[PDB]
Scaffold this active site. Structure first.
Site, mmCIF file in Angstrom:
data_model
loop_
_atom_site.group_PDB
_atom_site.id
_atom_site.type_symbol
_atom_site.label_atom_id
_atom_site.label_comp_id
_atom_site.label_asym_id
_atom_site.label_seq_id
_atom_site.Cartn_x
_atom_site.Cartn_y
_atom_site.Cartn_z
ATOM 1 N N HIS A 246 0.799 -1.218 0.000
ATOM 2 C CA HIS A 246 0.000 0.000 0.000
ATOM 3 C C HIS A 246 0.833 1.270 0.000
ATOM 4 O O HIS A 246 0.376 2.292 -0.517
ATOM 5 C CB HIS A 246 -0.935 0.022 1.216
ATOM 6 C CG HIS A 246 -1.860 -1.153 1.285
ATOM 7 N ND1 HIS A 246 -3.154 -1.113 0.814
ATOM 8 C CD2 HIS A 246 -1.674 -2.405 1.768
ATOM 9 C CE1 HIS A 246 -3.728 -2.287 1.005
ATOM 10 N NE2 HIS A 246 -2.852 -3.090 1.582
ATOM 11 N N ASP B 208 -6.646 5.208 1.614
ATOM 12 C CA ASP B 208 -6.647 3.807 1.217
ATOM 13 C C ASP B 208 -8.045 3.211 1.342
ATOM 14 O O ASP B 208 -8.864 3.659 2.148
ATOM 15 C CB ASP B 208 -5.656 3.008 2.066
ATOM 16 C CG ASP B 208 -5.312 1.659 1.455
ATOM 17 O OD1 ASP B 208 -6.234 0.859 1.193
ATOM 18 O OD2 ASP B 208 -4.110 1.402 1.228
ATOM 19 N N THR C 273 -5.406 -0.424 -4.117
ATOM 20 C CA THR C 273 -4.065 -0.852 -4.495
ATOM 21 C C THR C 273 -4.049 -2.173 -5.256
ATOM 22 O O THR C 273 -2.962 -2.702 -5.516
ATOM 23 C CB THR C 273 -3.181 -0.962 -3.251
ATOM 24 O OG1 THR C 273 -3.731 -1.936 -2.355
ATOM 25 C CG2 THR C 273 -3.099 0.381 -2.539
ATOM 26 N N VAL D 224 15.140 -6.904 -2.143
ATOM 27 C CA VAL D 224 15.841 -6.672 -3.400
ATOM 28 C C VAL D 224 15.190 -5.514 -4.144
ATOM 29 O O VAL D 224 14.116 -5.037 -3.758
ATOM 30 C CB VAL D 224 15.857 -7.942 -4.271
ATOM 31 C CG1 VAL D 224 16.491 -9.096 -3.512
ATOM 32 C CG2 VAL D 224 14.446 -8.299 -4.713
ATOM 33 N N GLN E 162 13.255 -4.975 -6.991
ATOM 34 C CA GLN E 162 12.470 -5.727 -7.965
ATOM 35 C C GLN E 162 12.326 -4.971 -9.280
ATOM 36 O O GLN E 162 12.159 -5.591 -10.336
ATOM 37 C CB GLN E 162 11.097 -6.057 -7.375
ATOM 38 C CG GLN E 162 10.205 -6.901 -8.269
ATOM 39 C CD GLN E 162 9.086 -7.577 -7.502
ATOM 40 O OE1 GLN E 162 9.333 -8.373 -6.595
ATOM 41 N NE2 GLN E 162 7.848 -7.259 -7.859
ATOM 42 N N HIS F 189 3.345 -14.349 -6.854
ATOM 43 C CA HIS F 189 2.072 -14.568 -6.181
ATOM 44 C C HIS F 189 0.956 -13.715 -6.763
ATOM 45 O O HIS F 189 -0.170 -13.775 -6.258
ATOM 46 C CB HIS F 189 2.207 -14.283 -4.682
ATOM 47 C CG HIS F 189 2.378 -12.831 -4.355
ATOM 48 N ND1 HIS F 189 3.112 -11.970 -5.141
ATOM 49 C CD2 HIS F 189 1.905 -12.089 -3.325
ATOM 50 C CE1 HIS F 189 3.087 -10.761 -4.610
ATOM 51 N NE2 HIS F 189 2.361 -10.806 -3.507
ATOM 52 N N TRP G 270 -0.779 -7.218 -7.016
ATOM 53 C CA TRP G 270 -1.083 -6.313 -8.120
ATOM 54 C C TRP G 270 0.051 -5.336 -8.394
ATOM 55 O O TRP G 270 0.232 -4.909 -9.540
ATOM 56 C CB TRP G 270 -2.380 -5.555 -7.849
ATOM 57 C CG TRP G 270 -2.882 -4.834 -9.061
ATOM 58 C CD1 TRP G 270 -3.037 -3.488 -9.210
ATOM 59 C CD2 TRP G 270 -3.268 -5.425 -10.309
ATOM 60 N NE1 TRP G 270 -3.511 -3.204 -10.469
ATOM 61 C CE2 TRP G 270 -3.659 -4.375 -11.164
ATOM 62 C CE3 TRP G 270 -3.327 -6.739 -10.784
ATOM 63 C CZ2 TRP G 270 -4.104 -4.599 -12.465
ATOM 64 C CZ3 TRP G 270 -3.768 -6.959 -12.078
ATOM 65 C CH2 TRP G 270 -4.150 -5.895 -12.902
ATOM 66 N N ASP H 114 -6.938 -11.899 -3.055
ATOM 67 C CA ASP H 114 -7.317 -11.529 -4.410
ATOM 68 C C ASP H 114 -6.360 -12.060 -5.469
ATOM 69 O O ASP H 114 -6.491 -11.695 -6.642
ATOM 70 C CB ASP H 114 -7.397 -10.007 -4.526
ATOM 71 C CG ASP H 114 -6.056 -9.336 -4.292
ATOM 72 O OD1 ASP H 114 -5.232 -9.898 -3.540
ATOM 73 O OD2 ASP H 114 -5.823 -8.250 -4.860
ATOM 74 N N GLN H 115 -5.407 -12.909 -5.087
ATOM 75 C CA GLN H 115 -4.347 -13.292 -6.010
ATOM 76 C C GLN H 115 -4.819 -14.268 -7.082
ATOM 77 O O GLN H 115 -4.206 -14.326 -8.153
ATOM 78 C CB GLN H 115 -3.174 -13.874 -5.225
ATOM 79 C CG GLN H 115 -2.517 -12.851 -4.311
ATOM 80 C CD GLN H 115 -1.594 -13.482 -3.291
ATOM 81 O OE1 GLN H 115 -1.351 -14.687 -3.320
ATOM 82 N NE2 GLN H 115 -1.077 -12.668 -2.378
HETATM 83 O O1 LIG Z 1 12.129 -8.090 -2.367
HETATM 84 C C1 LIG Z 1 11.200 -7.357 -2.703
HETATM 85 C C2 LIG Z 1 9.805 -7.614 -2.484
HETATM 86 C C3 LIG Z 1 8.894 -6.723 -2.905
HETATM 87 N N1 LIG Z 1 9.242 -5.557 -3.545
HETATM 88 C C4 LIG Z 1 8.220 -4.592 -3.994
HETATM 89 O O2 LIG Z 1 7.207 -4.492 -3.015
HETATM 90 C C5 LIG Z 1 5.914 -4.379 -3.669
HETATM 91 C C6 LIG Z 1 5.110 -5.624 -3.393
HETATM 92 O O3 LIG Z 1 3.763 -5.434 -3.887
HETATM 93 P P1 LIG Z 1 2.899 -6.717 -4.312
HETATM 94 O O4 LIG Z 1 3.595 -7.431 -5.422
HETATM 95 O O5 LIG Z 1 1.481 -6.302 -4.527
HETATM 96 O O6 LIG Z 1 2.976 -7.628 -2.992
HETATM 97 P P2 LIG Z 1 2.305 -7.508 -1.541
HETATM 98 O O7 LIG Z 1 2.867 -6.319 -0.835
HETATM 99 O O8 LIG Z 1 2.362 -8.835 -0.860
HETATM 100 O O9 LIG Z 1 0.792 -7.194 -1.970
HETATM 101 C C7 LIG Z 1 -0.277 -7.052 -1.074
HETATM 102 O O10 LIG Z 1 -1.065 -5.938 -1.458
HETATM 103 C C8 LIG Z 1 -1.549 -6.035 -2.811
HETATM 104 C C9 LIG Z 1 -2.256 -4.738 -3.120
HETATM 105 O O11 LIG Z 1 -3.341 -4.512 -2.224
HETATM 106 C C10 LIG Z 1 -2.457 -7.254 -2.929
HETATM 107 O O12 LIG Z 1 -2.904 -7.379 -4.276
HETATM 108 C C11 LIG Z 1 -1.708 -8.506 -2.505
HETATM 109 O O13 LIG Z 1 -2.581 -9.635 -2.513
HETATM 110 C C12 LIG Z 1 -1.110 -8.325 -1.119
HETATM 111 O O14 LIG Z 1 -0.314 -9.448 -0.749
HETATM 112 C C13 LIG Z 1 6.255 -4.131 -5.145
HETATM 113 O O15 LIG Z 1 6.580 -2.763 -5.354
HETATM 114 C C14 LIG Z 1 7.513 -4.990 -5.288
HETATM 115 O O16 LIG Z 1 8.297 -4.706 -6.428
HETATM 116 C C15 LIG Z 1 10.565 -5.240 -3.793
HETATM 117 O O17 LIG Z 1 10.906 -4.208 -4.359
HETATM 118 N N2 LIG Z 1 11.473 -6.168 -3.350
#
Ligand SMILES: O=c1ccn([C@@H]2O[C@H](COP(=O)(O)OP(=O)(O)O[C@H]3O[C@H](CO)[C@@H](O)[C@H](O)[C@H]3O)[C@@H](O)[C@H]2O)c(=O)[nH]1
Length: 436
Positions: free
Chosen positions: A12, A99, A122, A316, A318, A333, A336, A357-358
């Site tokens: 978020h 949010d 989000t 990392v 990403q 996973h 979004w 929601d995955q």
């Molecule tokens: O090592 C890592 C891990 C994550 N990220 C970043 O962190 C964010 C992760 O977002 P997302 O891929 O949506 O994962 P979650 O934070 O787990 O997402 C949660 O929030 C989303 C939006 O509400 C939902 O769709 C998911 O189900 C919920 O798990 C992105 O910017 C990634 O690139 C990094 O940069 N490095």
């Protein structure tokens, strides 16, 4: 003057700060509300990196009396403290974007401020359609008894099966079951909804929401996506060992593996992942979040003998990994944020949904022709996914070249949704007009 209020977790905070950067490029004064103390350390590192890169944004500390689902209640049980804090703010407020998970307590606060208020969902617009259609579903009390398909008219996905519905939304005495039943009817008392998506991935669901087809009384939903990664998220790693390992690899051969920001997989399921990574025959970059003797001797040996895999326990970058040309696949996973990021860099996705929601987000990618996910793997913890299925799925995706073609045009549609025509460009322009 816009005010932002992200929820807990990097899922978020990341799209909210990327929304701030796009508003600042539209010449705005943005007030970032920070419910402190923040939960994770990565939230602390991204905030100070973003606040230092943009020292003109206002940071209003939302102090809460004394764990992502822990401050969930402390924010809404103490939301009546932002009324003196936000009203005592000049230049006067012109809009408010908070949010969706905070739509329950922040709506009385936003209505008592006299500014057009919005929510920033989000996740995908298709999931937002499921969130909006949820009141209409539960009214037919044949639920969850005789519910086989959730057919929302005009959404991107065909028909959402019962297998894709979040499990807690079906069991009685559930929190999200009652949260959805009170937060979704509040959507009518809004001025609009911002969603991180674009036409190239969710054309039908965006047109179904704006056309009054999901549920009646919906405000205009804006597709301000994609939220491309910015430079304030980039950490100056003194080692930089990950990017330099990807450089010495043929472009399009590395399989990036990441399950989000929490990764609640057990020790049993983690063994078969690494066992399936080396049984696929492709090089991989496996990112694991422990929150330790999981890998096997002959598995660690084959990762070093064959010289193909990287295993890291760290936050990392990403954006650079997906942007690196050596990465050709993405085992995700289907969070979004990672989906929109993979859509921006044109990396095909092997969907492995786990919770929430995955499964719906995985079908949005599969409908676009640039992603594949096995419905039989079910949610996390339902059954053990063997490494043979993992290696077979990875080989099926990396050998499938049509997925790269569709993922390339999705990248083109993403690059066209922020520049020439730009659904993100237009919607943000149409938001500046109502904020007169
Ligand atoms: O090592 C890592 C891990 C994550 N990220 C970043 O962190 C964010 C992760 O977002 P997302 O891929 O949506 O994962 P979650 O934070 O787990 O997402 C949660 O929030 C989303 C939006 O509400 C939902 O769709 C998911 O189900 C919920 O798990 C992105 O910017 C990634 O690139 C990094 O940069 N490095």
């Amino acid at each position: 003057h816009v005010a932002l209020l992200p929820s807990a977790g990097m899922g978020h905070l990341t799209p909210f700060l990327r929304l701030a950067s796009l508003l600042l490029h539209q010449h705005c004064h943005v007030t970032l509300i920070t419910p402190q103390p923040t939960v994770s350390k990565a939230e602390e590192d991204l905030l100070s990196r973003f606040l230092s890169a943009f020292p003109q944004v206002n940071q209003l500390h939302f102090h809460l009396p004394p764990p992502f689902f822990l401050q969930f209640a402390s924010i809404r049980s103490s939301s009546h403290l932002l009324t003196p804090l936000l009203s005592s703010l000049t230049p006067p407020l012109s809009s408010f974007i908070y949010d969706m998970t905070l739509i329950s307590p922040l709506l009385p606060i936003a209505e008592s401020l006299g500014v057009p208020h919005y929510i920033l969902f989000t996740s995908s617009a298709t999931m937002f359609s499921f969130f909006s259609y949820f009141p209409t579903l539960a009214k037919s009390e044949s639920f969850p008894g005789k519910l086989d398909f959730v057919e929302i008219p005009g959404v991107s996905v065909s028909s959402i099966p019962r297998s894709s519905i979040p499990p807690p939304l079906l069991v009685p005495n559930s929190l999200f079951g009652k949260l959805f039943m009170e937060d979704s009817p509040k959507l009518k008392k809004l001025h609009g909804v911002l969603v991180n998506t674009f036409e190239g991935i969710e054309k039908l669901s965006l047109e179904a929401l704006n056309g009054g087809k999901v549920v009646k009384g919906l405000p205009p939903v804006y597709g301000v996506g994609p939220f491309v990664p910015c430079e304030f998220e980039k950490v100056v790693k003194r080692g930089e060992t990950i990017s330099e390992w990807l450089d010495e690899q043929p472009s399009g051969s590395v399989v990036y593996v990441s399950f989000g920001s929490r990764t609640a997989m057990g020790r049993e399921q983690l063994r078969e992942v690494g066992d399936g990574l080396v049984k696929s025959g492709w090089r991989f970059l496996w990112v694991v979040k422990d929150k330790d003797g999981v890998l096997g001797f002959e598995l660690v040996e084959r990762m070093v003998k064959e010289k193909k895999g990287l295993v890291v326990k760290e936050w990392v970058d990403q954006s650079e990994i997906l942007g690196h040309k050596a990465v050709g696949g993405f085992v995700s996973h289907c969070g979004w944020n990672s989906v929109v990021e993979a859509a921006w860099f044109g990396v095909k996705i092997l969907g492995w949904p786990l919770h929430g929601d995955q499964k719906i987000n995985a079908e949005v990618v599969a409908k676009g022709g640039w992603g594949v996910w096995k419905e039989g793997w079910d949610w996390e913890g339902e059954r053990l996914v063997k490494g043979e299925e993992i290696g077979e799925a990875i080989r099926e995706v990396m050998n499938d070249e049509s997925l790269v073609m569709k993922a390339t045009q999705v990248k083109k549609d993403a690059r066209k949704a922020i520049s020439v025509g730009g659904g993100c460009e237009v919607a943000l322009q149409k938001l500046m007009e109502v904020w007169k």
